[PDB]
């Protein structure tokens, strides 16, 4: 698709068999989702955003569908205000910015 | 251009007579620039992201040149860690996300 930006670029994602809404976020290096259970081990990570830094749980090699496109990669879990799809998975679904 | 997302989508902007580097950020509703002076009136605002909120100054009807394309709109000024071009100005330069 070609998504304009007059509204937030929200899409449906599917992770752990559950549908969620997430924001396609070219300003995010990494994908960060609200608290949920994921399989396997996690590693610590700190990410910094507009109000400061937060701790998240880093899960690698997680299967996630984004707007109908399959991705398998790193998902950070923590107190993000909205689910955000960052560049690590936007590249997997072939997304580009165009103007 | 077409900008891939392997790296942060940074561009040069011109604002208030100054050249700055900024991030093309589809996850940002509004444009937020590090501290600088701008002409005219402003009003205080709080904006929130990962990490919490910051206080900014809201200036309306500001012209910015973004990668060579002129746009006008609201610019928030305050202690953001990165200059961000948000959707309010991305729309004006015809930016889309494509996959
Ligand atoms: C979290 C989003 C809903 C909103 N943010 C835009 C987002 O693109 C920020 C934009 C951003 C970018 C760098 C630093 C601070 C904020 N990215 C971000 O927090 O990404 C974090 C996850 O990946 C990491 O890579 C970047 C920092 C980490 S925001 O910076 O909080 C913000 C909120 C409101 C406005 N008007 C403008 C920006
Ligand atoms: Cl605006
Ligand atoms: Cl349009
Ligand atoms: Na003004």
Swiss-Prot record, chains A, B:
Superkingdom of the organism of origin: Viruses
Domain Peptidase A2: 20-89
Active site: 25
Region described as Dimerization of protease: 1-5, 49-55, 88-99
Protein's job: Aspartyl protease that mediates proteolytic cleavages of Gag and Gag-Pol polyproteins during or shortly after the release of the virion from the plasma membrane. Cleavages take place as an ordered, step-wise cascade to yield mature proteins. This process is called maturation. Displays maximal activity during the budding process just prior to particle release from the cell. Also cleaves Nef and Vif, probably concomitantly with viral structural proteins on maturation of virus particles. Hydrolyzes host EIF4GI and PABP1 in order to shut off the capped cellular mRNA translation.
Description of how the protein assembles with itself and partners: Homodimer, whose active site consists of two apposed aspartic acid residues.
Name listed for the protein in its UniProt record: Protease
Protein source organism: Human immunodeficiency virus type 1 group M subtype B (isolate BH10)
Species lineage: Viruses, Riboviria, Pararnavirae, Artverviricota, Revtraviricetes
Name of the gene encoding the protein in the UniProt record: gag-pol
Full-sequence portion shown in this chain: 501 to 599 of 1447
């Amino acid at each position: 698709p070609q998504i304009t930006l007059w509204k937030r670029p929200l899409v449906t994602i599917k992770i752990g068999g559950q549908l969620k809404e997430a924001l396609l976020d070219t300003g995010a290096d990494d994908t960060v989702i609200e608290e949920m259970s994921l399989p396997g081990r996690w590693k610590p990570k700190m990410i910094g955003g507009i109000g400061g830094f937060i701790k998240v749980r880093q899960y690698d090699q997680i299967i996630i569908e984004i707007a109908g496109h399959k991705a398998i990669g790193t998902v950070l879990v923590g107190p993000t205000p909205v689910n955000i799809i960052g560049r690590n998975l936007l590249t997997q679904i072939g997304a580009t910015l165009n103007f």
